């Protein structure tokens, strides 16, 4: 019943003391933190506490949208040699640093996921040519579904896939995705392997990655310019912003101290130094 | 420093003999045949985070002058109700000396550490033929 | 719904318990037909596009 926006426990006025009770003495061998408050050690007056923990609630701590990835696509001229650039990105929070570390404060989580799409385009070649306002399809390809090989192949029919046709210039795109995990919680860290190396099998056949569950965990997004070739080249950058809503978490873990290296927990050399120089007897 | 998440199963599961932490990170350079093991830096708690924060995990600190043992009852913790034990490890028991060992005015003191663990409320499903894993 | 180690399913096998016995003047070899079906407790989620069909150009 104690909500987030509740006033914190008050400070009780306590006077001088000379008794056989020892708030001050403990033993951190027990693993337990000694739970004291100012009054326990020094004389205090009465204080009606006003501050609340309101903002520090798990839900509020993740209430911000965050850039997960930057997908780049383009629409070149018809005569061109290179193909029209259409991107495919494996949906994961671990491509960027910020949001990841925040999510790493715990062992597991559940959250309905909100994605936002900020598209931004421009020309590239020195020319005064023209491009009419461009549209963009963002097709979510769940694991196993046919990944588009061309920018104009059958896959874009999306008879079952959930897509979003964004018209450039209008407000950023947004879609809601519930907790879609195969487990009873999303796993930030997975101490194990997908395969088991059997003895009646060759090492190769039984080998897999350390820390990985399913290579394809959530699927890929596919983004393409819908409008056809235009004599003047136009490149586009779609920025995805994720805001984890309705979030729950379990078992806290120490926050990442050294820079990330790969999708794993691994650390690169040359970054193994986080704390600076400070003399013990210097304030 | 070339291959992330590359530790092989055989090095990931060192059984009852277990493993250790190191005082320095030394990259594996033999790309002809990698050593594929964990190099768990002590101060980084072996996972890129400052040891001093290791207390967020359930724990006890055996401080010689006081106690002589550490007892940590652990419940099953995972993302699933039941999971493949062969493939995945639920818990981790890390022991690192917060204060180095010192005895008298001696140069080489030695005292042993013994771990006794007892599985509790264990349940297993899907009975089949026995798995003979390639541990070596 | 794809080949994955993490979500592997196991193995279905059929072996001769005894053997097949037939008297004289009888076809010594015959056939067995297999069927599969989900059960009342089965379900499917996260709708997606199939690969078992395509339109080339």
């Amino acid at each position, epitope marked *: 019943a104690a909500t987030s926006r509740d006033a914190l426990p008050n400070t009780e006025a306590s006077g001088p003391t000379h008794s056989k009770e020892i708030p001050a003495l403990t033993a951190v061998e027990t693993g337990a933190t000694n739970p004291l408050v100012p009054s326990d050690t020094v004389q205090t007056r009465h204080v009606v506490q006003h501050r609340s923990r309101s903002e520090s609630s798990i839900e509020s701590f993740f209430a911000r949208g965050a850039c997960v990835t930057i997908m780049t696509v383009d629409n070149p001229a018809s005569t061109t040699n290179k193909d029209k650039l259409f991107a495919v990105w494996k949906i994961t929070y671990k491509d960027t640093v910020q949001l990841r570390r925040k999510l790493e404060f715990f062992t597991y989580s559940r959250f309905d996921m909100e994605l936002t799409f900020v598209v931004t385009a421009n020309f590239t070649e020195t020319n005064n040519g023209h491009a009419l306002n461009q549209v963009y399809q963002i097709m979510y390809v769940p694991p196993g579904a046919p990944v588009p090989e061309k920018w104009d192949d059958y896959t874009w029919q999306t008879s079952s896939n959930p897509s979003i046709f964004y018209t450039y210039g209008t407000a950023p795109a947004r879609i809601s995705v519930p907790y879609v995990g195969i487990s009873n919680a999303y796993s930030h860290f997975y101490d194990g392997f997908s395969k088991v190396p059997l003895k009646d099998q060759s090492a190769a056949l039984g080998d897999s990655l350390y820390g990985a569950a399913s290579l*394809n965990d959530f699927g890929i997004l596919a983004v393409r310019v819908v409008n056809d070739h235009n004599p003047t080249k136009v490149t586009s950058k779609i920025r995805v912003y994720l805001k984890p809503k309705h979030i729950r978490v379990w078992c806290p873990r120490p926050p990442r101290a050294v820079a990330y290296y790969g999708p794993g927990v691994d650390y690169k050399d040359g970054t193994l130094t986080p704390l600076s120089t400070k003399d013990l007897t210097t304030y | 420093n070339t291959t992330t998440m590359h530790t092989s199963y055989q090095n990931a599961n060192p059984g009852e003999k277990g493993g250790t932490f190191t005082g320095t990170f030394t990259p594996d350079n033999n790309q002809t045949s990698p050593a*594929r093991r964990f190099c768990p830096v002590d101060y980084l708690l072996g996972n890129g985070t400052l040891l001093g924060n290791a207390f967020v995990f359930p724990h006890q600190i055996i401080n010689l002058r006081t106690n002589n043992c550490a007892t940590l009852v652990l419940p099953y913790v995972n993302s699933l109700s039941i999971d493949s034990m062969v493939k995945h490890n639920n818990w981790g028991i890390a022991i690192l000396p917060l204060a180095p060992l010192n005895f008298a005015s001696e140069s080489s003191p030695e005292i042993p550490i013994t771990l006794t663990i007892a599985p509790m409320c264990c349940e297993f499903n899907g009975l089949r033929n026995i798995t003979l894993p390639r541990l070596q | 719904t794809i080949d994955d180690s993490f979500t592997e399913g196991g193995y279905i096998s059929v072996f001769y318990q005894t053997r097949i016995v037939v008297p004289l003047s009888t076809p010594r070899e015959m056939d067995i037909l297999g069927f599969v079906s989900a059960c009342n407790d089965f379900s499917v989620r996260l709708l997606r596009d199939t690969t078992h069909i395509e339109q080339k150009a």
Partner: nanobody
Amino acid sequence: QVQLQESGGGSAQTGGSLRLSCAASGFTFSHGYMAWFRQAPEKEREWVACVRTSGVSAYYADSVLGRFTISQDNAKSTLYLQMNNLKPEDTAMYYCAATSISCSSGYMFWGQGTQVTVSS
């Protein structure tokens, strides 16, 4: 648009050698593996060999052991399959399956493949 395009041909005499290459693009998130697969004329698709992300740690198929060599050049973002001692069993199509992996089986990107023929 992770474009995997094989090359290397396939029309050698029995016993020779060929260099099977594969140009990779798009976003190959290094970490994982990169490999080779063969379908054969009339058999099931079979795994040939897999090499680690950037690491030169690899394995080979029992059938091909030592007679096939799979490397990489992540500077050139390519993988190579040198094949010495080609034989009548090696006559088949080869595919550069280099994406995700994590092992020697999972994929989200294949190539168009190329045929090899060891004649004699």
